[PDB]
């Protein structure tokens, strides 16, 4: 695999520093500061190594969780006053082909968005993913069985978010067929 070039290359400058230290979580995999085993040396890992490595994957977790909450929320909140602004243009043409031209680029940008925050949440889950599944295999230390459903765990913001972005689908349909 090529993931460490692969995050790197696939950066955008509005999540530029929330990233996955990816190459700084495989350096520390390095870092081993046990006994010296041999191999036809390189130190072994321990419970104070494996203490250092949590420590820091957890700081690297709870730094993309805080960028997906705060990016996440700014579309819902796009979305709230795009479909007020969509509902009386719907309203008033029932009771102008600039004022759905306008909506439609306004609308557009926000599924743009969605897309780009989807992407940042697969590169990085992809991430994490990857890094826990080198620890086990370099190591011998199994991180996997508690960090899989901690990534997997949902937070409050998401199912709200979800409806929001099954809606922006539908406000968008709406704005380019009238
Ligand atoms: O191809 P690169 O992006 O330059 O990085 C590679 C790659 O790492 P990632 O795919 O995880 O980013 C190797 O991983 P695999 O091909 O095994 O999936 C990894 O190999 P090992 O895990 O077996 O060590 C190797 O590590 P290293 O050379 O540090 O031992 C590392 O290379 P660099 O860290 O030197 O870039």
């Given at each position: 695999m090529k993931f460490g070039q692969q995050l790197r290359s696939s950066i955008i400058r509005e999540y530029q520093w929330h990233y996955i230290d990816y190459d700084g979580l495989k350096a520390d995999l390095k870092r081993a500061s046990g006994p010296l085993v041999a191999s036809s040396?390189?130190?072994?890992?321990?419970?104070?190594?494996e203490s250092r490595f949590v420590s820091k994957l957890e700081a690297e977790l709870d730094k993309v969780h805080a960028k997906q909450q705060v990016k996440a929320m700014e579309i819902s909140?796009?979305?709230?006053?795009?479909?007020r602004e969509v509902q009386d243009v719907v309203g008033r043409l029932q009771d102008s082909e600039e004022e759905f031209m306008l909506?439609?680029?306004?609308?557009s940008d926000i599924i743009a968005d969605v897309h780009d925050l989807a992407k940042f949440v697969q590169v990085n889950y992809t991430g994490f993913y990857k890094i826990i599944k080198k620890h086990?295999?370099?190591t011998g230390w199994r991180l996997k069985p508690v960090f899989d459903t901690?990534?997997?765990?949902?937070?409050?913001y998401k199912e709200n978010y979800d409806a929001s972005v099954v809606?922006?689908?539908?406000?968008?349909?709406?704005?380019?067929?009238?």
């Open positions: 040396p390189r130190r072994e890992w321990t419970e104070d190594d909140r796009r979305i709230a006053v795009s479909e909506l439609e680029e306004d609308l086990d295999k370099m901690r990534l997997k765990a949902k937070p409050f809606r922006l689908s539908k406000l968008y349909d709406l704005v380019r067929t009238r």
